From a paper:
While this level of potency did not warrant follow-up itself, the hit remained of interest because, simultaneously, 1 was identified in a screen against malarial [name]-[name] [name] (IC50 5 µM). This class of enzyme uses ATP, to ligate the amino acid [name] to its uncharged [name], making [name]-[name] available for use by the protein synthesis machinery. Genetic analysis has shown that in [name] the [name]-[name] [name] gene ([name]) is essential. [name] LysRS consists of an N-terminal anticodon binding domain (residues 1–150) [name] the typical oligonucleotide binding fold, common to [name]-, asparaginyl- and aspartyl- [name] synthetases, consisting of a central six-stranded beta-barrel [name] loops or alpha helices connecting the strands. The C-terminal catalytic domain (residues 151–505) consists of a largely antiparallel beta-sheet flanked by alpha helices, typical of class II aminoacyl-[name] synthetases.
Initial SAR exploration for the series: exchanging the pyrimidine for a pyridine, expansion of the cyclopentyl to cyclohexyl, and replacement of the H in the 4-position [name] F were all tolerated and improved potency, although [name] no selectivity over the human ortholog KARS1. The observed improvement in potency was enough to allow the first compound/protein structures to be obtained, following soaking of ligands into Apo crystals. Structural characterization of ligands showed them to bind in the adenosine pocket, stacked between the side chains of Phe269 and Arg481. In contrast, a small 4-fluoro-substituent, which does not enter the selectivity pocket and had no selectivity at the enzyme level, surprisingly showed an increase in inhibition of the mutant protein compared to the WT. The early, non-selective molecule 2, blocked expression of both COX1 and SDHA, indicating inhibition of both cytoplasmic and mitochondrial translation, whereas treatment [name] 7, 5, or 8 (≤100 µM) did not inhibit the production of either COX1 or SDHA. The MIC potency for the series was not impacted when performed in the presence of 1 mM [name], unlike mupirocin ([name] isoleucine); this was not unexpected, because [name] the co-[name] structures compound binding did not involve the [name] binding site.
Author numbering:
A (entry chain A), B (entry chain A): 12 to 25, 28 to 74, 76 to 90, 95, 100 to 127, 130 to 134, 136 to 150, 155 to 353, ...
The structure:
């Protein structure tokens, strides 16, 4: 109902300007605080300032007292002025005030005032799914939302800083592709009016990033959304921000180091500690070195028998039954369903079934396995790293097998047959990075989900 | 045909490794050059280096001589080794060589060698539309492609640096939206499997970025692709990288300054001069201050009569006929078709027909016009800046009018009725920025178009 009284204060203000083109705000409230950090309380200083702020509290009394909250969360007596103030000023109203900075019997500004923005809705004094459907109000009313938003920003900025330092170059590769490669996922398809064909929202930059390496790039990344037309869950969302990285004259052993160094550098710059406090009352250490295990061996120890590339699916099936399609898939599933869930400490698992790893080079010594890793941090599948498959004929086969389960990405296969140097790729989910770092749920990490 | 001989050298090399997982490359060729800048030519130095390089030239003679070109473009005698070399090594083959750095009777490496990547295609010794459909080969064979790629990268990095310095925060807003607002364009629609509904690939971050400002952001940007399901031309492509920017307690007069300062800072950091050399043999100065003109006045002087907001469409129609839908549209079209095309120097045109500017605040004094500008640089529509419309009731109307020409973006209108501070937005096309800066065509600016 208060929706209508506010709209009526708008209408009756309209030769007063409730949405004025400008106001001469001289300082943010942070700026005013950082200025006057220990003012002898109940004393006046002649520093004049134009400040603005959301009136999130009032206390009307010859003298009104409000709380102007700046958008970051920082907080900071005309007879006709006072009347206007009382009659015109609600809560969730953005308000400019020019005057002398004092401190009360709390830092306050005491000469002029004007409405910067008249709110036609009061602030709710919030369900998880009304915080996310209205992040703008979440951000106004919940200091955690304001912190979470600025963390992702600081994390993402730490990432670019960490890669750039290492002489990586961020590139922009197509989001609309004639076919979407670089991952096992169902695409989002959109009809082009221009070309009168369907196009595919990238699932991954990998194949394009690989064309760059052929193209002569030493070190490339892309930090940007990918689109996986599948079901959202606690670790999955169909649109998500991803990092991918490609370094020439390195292997998965090289990219494992960098991936660690990167994450530890992000914890530092964004969070200021590797002793990650969680909402579980606990602290998750990610400092120091991280344990590498091979999938097969680790799976074997867990099952109490030797599982190799050579282990039949008939065998694996049986073991999977005893616990409650293909070899590679069964290995990964068993490994996840056994060792995976057990892992607490940050852990690289490497040497992957050649089946479930089409783009990854076969292992240098070990037959049957590919030089891929996965990084598990705080029990979340965080980040993968490959020694990259630069053999077009093999690559052609891997895809052939894929298709059989039949048009291939011929341009990509063309690119490879020009010659790709030996290079190691990584992928890493930013939402998972934040989840893994914070204990925040995926829906809290992104600004505007649905 | 050489496609088959190469595939046969692959097959016959396979216990030689033509795609080896690693090679111990110690330096890039740049690194080796930067190391030995003025070596007394035809003299040997005992600095040993593992280098790799694309053999883009051969000259087989007891002694072969190649050109190893590093991916950036930089350039740098076993009897059985020599035989292998001759028989095994083609052109466009990536090759590692360990040995002593010397200079010939040209800087050369003279101990071991190995194939890093066997190319199953030779390099073409290129049509604009086979350079773009094969950028990986363009990048190998055309030093300009290598420069253009690294410029966009440096431009984009200059942009983030320039904004970040000014205390802007890059945010990630949805690419898939339930409806796509922030611009006049037909969206790309994709069916979600998750939600079983169509979603819309953002045309612009504007409405989401505006929710951020409501949310309490002081200064935000987003630098990232937008999707405009319309026809590609010399200045238009349906997928393009865009900058958008929003500053609280500023007007279009404020955002005009920043837009200039930003572009001039990008010229500097990326190009190293404001005297932009063009392929037209000419130099385009963008240094110093830039001319602001009002659309109406400038249009008037060009037509030789007074055109105001009040000028009828019947009148404007007539004038448009005399030269060869709505007022706002006719004004903009006439202005473009007259003053626009005439402009050489970098020029802001401001004070826009309220019709064609729904999201832009009405002018503070001048009735009928909105506080929008457009920046024309070297005759290209580069960048727009608004004093932003924070009046939800007005905003509701602007959209109502739009629709009538009927579901509105109610969540956005909700956001505004919580209160948005006075803020000024900008948009800027990155491809146009590069075109405007270089004289390069849009298809040359993006890595992977189609
Ligand atoms: N639907 C999805 C799918 C994924 C993610 C997500 F948030 N939603 C994610 O982080 N993924 C991977 C995790 C491993 C390294 C690359 C990113 C996949
Ligand atoms: N289909 C399209 C549409 C546009 C652009 C482009 F390259 N392709 C572009 O640069 N636009 C504008 C130019 C004005 C300021 C914001 C960017 C629109
Ligand atoms: N494309 C991978 C990430 C890069 C892995 C290294 N090639 C993924 O979808 O997870
Ligand atoms: N959304 C605008 C750019 C931002 C203008 C300032 N609000 C466009 O489509 O060009």
């Amino acid at each position: 109902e208060q929706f209508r009284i506010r709209r009526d204060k708008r209408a009756r203000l309209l030769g007063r300007d409730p949405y004025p083109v400008a106001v001469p705000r001289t300082h943010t409230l942070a700026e005013v605080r950082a200025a006057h950090p220990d003012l002898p309380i109940d004393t006046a200083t002649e520093d004049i300032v134009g400040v603005a702020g959301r009136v999130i509290f009032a206390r009307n009394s010859k003298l009104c007292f409000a709380t102007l909250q700046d958008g970051d969360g920082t907080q900071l007596s005309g007879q006709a002025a006072l009347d206007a103030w009382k009659a015109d000023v609600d809560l969730g109203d953005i308000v400019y005030v020019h005057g002398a900075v004092i401190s009360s019997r709390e830092l306050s500004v005491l000469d002029c005032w004007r409405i910067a923005a008249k709110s036609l809705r009061p602030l709710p004094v919030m369900s998880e799914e009304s915080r996310v459907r209205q992040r703008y109000v979440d951000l106004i009313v919940r200091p955690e939302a304001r912190a979470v938003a600025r963390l992702r920003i600081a994390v993402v900025r730490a990432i670019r800083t960490a890669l750039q330092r290492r002489g990586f170059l961020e590139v922009e590769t197509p989001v609309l592709q004639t076919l979407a490669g670089g991952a096992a996922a169902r695409p989002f398809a959109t009809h082009s009016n221009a070309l009168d064909i369907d196009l595919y929202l990238r699932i991954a930059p990998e194949l394009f990033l690989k064309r760059c390496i052929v193209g002569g790039f030493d070190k490339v990344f892309e930090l940007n959304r990918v689109f996986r037309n599948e079901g959202a869950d606690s670790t999955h969302s169909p649109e998500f921000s991803m990092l991918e990285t490609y370094q020439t004259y390195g292997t998965y052993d090289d990219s494992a180091v960098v991936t660690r160094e990167l994450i530890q550098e992000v914890a530092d710059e964004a969070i200021g500690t590797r002793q990650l406090p969680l909402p579980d009352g606990s602290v998750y250490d990610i400092d120091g070195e991280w344990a590498t295990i091979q999938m097969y061996p680790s799976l074997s120890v867990a099952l109490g028998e030797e599982i190799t590339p050579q282990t039949t699916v008939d065998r694996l099936r049986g073991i999977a039954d005893s616990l409650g399609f293909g070899h590679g898939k069964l290995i990964e599933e068993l490994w996840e369903r056994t060792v995976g869930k057990s892992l607490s400490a940050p852990t690289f698992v490497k040497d992957f079934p050649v089946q479930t790893t089409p783009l990854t080079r076969q292992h240098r010594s070990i037959p049957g396995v590919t030089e891929k890793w996965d990084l598990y941090l705080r029990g979340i599948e965080l980040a993968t790293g490959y020694s990259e498959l630069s053999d077009p004929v093999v690559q052609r086969e891997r895809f052939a097998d894929q298709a059989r389960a039949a048009v291939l990405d011929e341009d990509f296969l063309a690119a490879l047959e020009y010659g790709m140097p030996p290079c190691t790729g990584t992928g890493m989910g930013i939402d998972r990075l934040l989840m893994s770092l914070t204990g925040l749920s995926i829906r809290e990490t992104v600004l505007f989900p649905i």
